[PDB]
Symmetry: C2
């Protein structure tokens, strides 16, 4: 159990520059005590001064009231909220209610990060409860909300909904595999319909969850990025410079396209070479695909590093815009590196495979090859992700008065900050696989379902012991990933459909693509209309109802009288008629 | 000038049933005086008792305050508003603030309608000002808002925006006609882009106008229809009965499809017969098209009567749903009766004209025919609409103490109530023509532009003298017509494109259709994003800003001190390091 410590700051103090660190440290303590936070300083590991800060209940209550009033201002209207408020008062510059200690913008370059402490007593209980169940009720998601903020709870709710909705993919995929053979248009139509209904129902459930948790309209609120650099003060930046920096993303995009496409082209060429000339023992015929998948995490990580460097050099005023741009770049890179192989196999080799002949000549036809390639690109990448996610940190950690608490905090500081965008990206990639290439191997979704049941626990374990406690945040939605999902769905509505024509056989292909796209749009509109007729609206309506309960013309008008003589002349005129 | 009379009620009193009319009349006077309205009764024409009602300023001010409070409840927050409030207090049943005098539901079957008086002094000035100008400023639309409510102002603003945006259609249509010959893909792409940008900019301007007029969120408010009939009281109706009545619209739809399609098929067959066998004098070769257009208003009117009868027999709880259903039916019928001829000419006769040969045999090839057919279906239907709109009521009216004021009101009562859905339907049909068939005749849009300049005045004149004063209403948007417009745009993105392939020549047609649709979607997303970066938001933000300003752990924490000894041990640990 913790000692009531709310937040911990590292403040590494290296031997070099040991003349301004003390001044920065004393300024940090003075500023942090100015906002009224109790502090305690202890030693750490490798010349570090770990400072633990906590809350005078009157000031905390005043801050909570101010935050609630601010939320009421924007129309928005527990451990997570308290920790969030403490972090906000720690981070918000001293301009209005806080003291700037951001480790990026101002002079606080000697601190690593500010993180909340992790409670092992709750963590072990949560892990045991989640691993001893089969399905997760809303109480578990509510507990995740109350402990690890709103973003983590939103991600876990999305994962649970996706895993639950994947049960029908597996159902009719197994049905098609057992009976409908391979490359059936009906399976593609059912997959598109499921993607549409899943997207719409997830949006509805997400709005319901936002209403329940009281985080409606949080996305509208804009939070300034401390790392943002301005030039004038109207804190403004020239948009021309921003678009100039953005234009750098284009040549990077084409360069990565060329590099990855060339790599996949050579791998495909050599694999078809060895499949055509080597008798082998089947399994060895697709070994380059497994090798490419195994190497995918390294190049993906270096590409994510390059993308995050580009985003950091791209000045963004607010947190939301920076996050959206980073998500867009990461999604583009992952889509590329995880789908170009299948795209080349399906829409390049299958329709016209005579263009790869020069590669075969340098080294020294079967529609069914895409099915095996999709089987591999479904089974093995999730295994590699599992290995790099859960079991390799296990190996790394196995390789390595109140002193035990200090040792626990010191070991916690080395743990990297847990991020949610990575898990969202993995889930979006899996959904794209399902929506775009399940026709080649209908069983694939089923496998993903199994993986999801592990992931919904495994990622939880990733939060527990392999990472430090995430900083609570409020997000109205899951972010731009939402839109990304829709895009993938639309792409599936073409992609899989075209595959059905390509692996079973010009005019027919275009007709099938057009029909599938129009059917996708029709069912999208139909499901949107159906869900428009159906939660949180009743609670909002009840809240709204409860708040609710909380001279010619003078002679003409002075002709006879008021009411009585009027009806007198009424009967008079009736009789005259 | 009027005598200060606010509203007028007819209350026809025929010779038959002259025993309950007097009781109904006395009940009407008592109920209307209960809500505090001065009344005056005079004779009319053909056994009618015209009653004029006006407002005690205290009660009117109280009603205005109550209405403003109700608008504040729903988040929404001049002669038109005053007249609307008077009509609301006249119509709202006596359950809460009013007295039910609706001429449909309750016993008030002896009254024709309740209408506001028309001011000729303002009307003649407005007509002269609009006819003496070239372009209309926002002041004219504001005056229309303050006089004839919000729906009329919204319609006139939409017409003005559409006429202004039609100037580029005419520009590049004349450019293509002079240089690019006929059936150019570039013209189709430009037409689709213009449709997209016009739709998006009209939505933006419409939101801006709603913000300016303070009618934001009015569409969310639901108004009960007095004619609605219920069975239980939870005022509810079984949805199964409603869908059973709705299902009747399907066989009616196919029956009208069959009838109109057969009529157009015979007309086309006979016109091609006479064009192939009769030397004539060209103009006489398309005479059946002119005859069909001239007969179109009669069948369109009978079909609108059938559709409104079906809608009336279809019980709708609220005004908004009833209006949406009626608009949907009317739009479907008009789309059918005004576009099936062109659709048959373009996508049936041109691709495979050998199926009409049996009709030619019973009676007893050229891509360029669609251009002439579109020329006729652009020039002559607007002429017929003009004839049936402005000049025929002119002929009808030429054929036919304070007594002159009474005579003026009596002549006003015979005038039919002006509706806006008809003008919206005409404009939507014109926009559909432009978006779907301008490739056949690029000059068509230009002609429409000219007509619009007349229409923006002519329809105004239709309000002035050929119809009674419309009852003011608030509408947040232009209604389901909005969505209809989008549909037409999408259809154009296919239709015109296909025409380009059909009049210039299977795989190519499908490729062109797919490319045009995808280009339309791409520019739609691009224009939506561009407009998302750009009004009323600043005023809302300023209003929002203005409203804003309106024991181990005890020993651990009690280790040394508060601030000072903390920094003492801070330097101590720094030195120890
Ligand atoms: Ca995983
Ligand atoms: Ca994961
Ligand atoms: Ca007209
Ligand atoms: Ca009109």
């Amino acid at each position: 159990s913790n000692f009531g410590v709310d937040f911990v700051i590292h403040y590494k103090v290296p031997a070099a520059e040991r003349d301004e660190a003390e001044a920065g440290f004393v300024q940090l303590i003075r500023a942090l005590t100015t906002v009224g936070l109790a502090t305690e300083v202890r030693h750490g590991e490798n010349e570090s001064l770990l400072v633990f800060v906590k809350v005078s209940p009157d000031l905390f209550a005043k801050q909570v009231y101010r935050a609630r009033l601010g939320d009421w201002l924007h129309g928005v209207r527990v451990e997570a909220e308290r920790l969030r408020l403490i972090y906000l008062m720690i981070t918000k510059p001293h301009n209005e209610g806080g003291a700037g200690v951001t480790p990026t913008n101002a002079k606080w370059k000697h601190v690593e990060s500010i993180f909340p402490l992790h409670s092992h007593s709750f963590n072990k209980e949560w892990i045991k409860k989640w691993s001893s169940k089969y399905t997760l009720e809303q109480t578990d998601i509510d507990n995740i909300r109350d402990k690890f903020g709103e973003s983590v709870a939103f991600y876990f709710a999305f994962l649970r909904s996706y895993f639950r909705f994947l049960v029908i993919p597996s159902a009719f995929g197994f049905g098609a595999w057992l009976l409908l053979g391979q490359f059936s248009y009906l399976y593609a139509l059912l997959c598109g319909l499921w993607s549409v209904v899943f997207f719409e129902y997830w949006k509805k459930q997400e709005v319901d969850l936002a209403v329940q948790w009281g985080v409606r309209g949080v996305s509208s609120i804009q939070q300034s990025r401390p790392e943002f650099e301005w030039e004038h003060e109207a804190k403004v930046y020239p948009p021309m410079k921003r678009v100039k920096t953005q234009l750098l993303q284009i040549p990077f995009a084409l360069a990565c396209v060329v590099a990855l496409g060339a790599l996949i082209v050579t791998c495909n060429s050599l694999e078809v070479f060895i499949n055509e000339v080597y008798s082998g023992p089947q399994y060895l015929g697709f070994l380059p695909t497994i090798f490419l998948v195994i190497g995918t995490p390294t190049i993906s990580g270096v590409l994510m590093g390059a993308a995050e460097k580009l985003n950091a050099m791209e000045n963004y005023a607010t947190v939301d815009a920076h996050d959206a741009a980073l998500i867009q770049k990461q999604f583009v890179l992952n889509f590329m590196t995880s789908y170009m192989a299948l795209f080349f196999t399906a829409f390049v080799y299958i329709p016209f495979g005579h263009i790869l002949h020069p590669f075969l000549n340098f080294w020294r036809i079967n529609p069914a090859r895409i099915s095996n390639q999709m089987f591999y690109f479904t089974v093995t990448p999730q295994i590699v992700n599992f290995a790099t996610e859960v079991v390799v940190p296990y190996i790394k950690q196995q390789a390595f008065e109140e002193a035990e608490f200090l040792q626990r905090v010191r070991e916690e500081c080395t743990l990297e900050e847990y991020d949610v965008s990575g898990d969202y990206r993995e889930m979006v990639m899996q959904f794209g696989y399902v929506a775009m290439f399940s026709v080649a191997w209908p069983l694939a979704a089923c496998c993903f379902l199994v993986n999801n049941w592990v992931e919904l626990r495994s990622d939880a374990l990733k939060i527990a012991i392999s990472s430090r406690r995430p900083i609570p945040w409020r997000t109205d939605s899951i972010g731009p990933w939402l839109t990304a999902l829709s895009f993938l769905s639309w792409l599936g509505s073409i992609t899989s459909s075209a595959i059905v024509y390509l692996c079973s056989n010009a005019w027919g292909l275009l007709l099938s693509i057009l029909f599938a796209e129009h059917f996708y749009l029709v069912v999208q509109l139909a499901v949107r209309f159906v869900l428009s007729k159906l939660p949180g609206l009743q609670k909002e309506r009840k809240e709204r109802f409860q708040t609710k309960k909380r001279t010619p013309e003078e002679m003409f008008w002075q002709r006879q009288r008021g009411m009585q003589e009027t009806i007198e002349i009424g009967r008079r005129m009736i009789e005259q008629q």
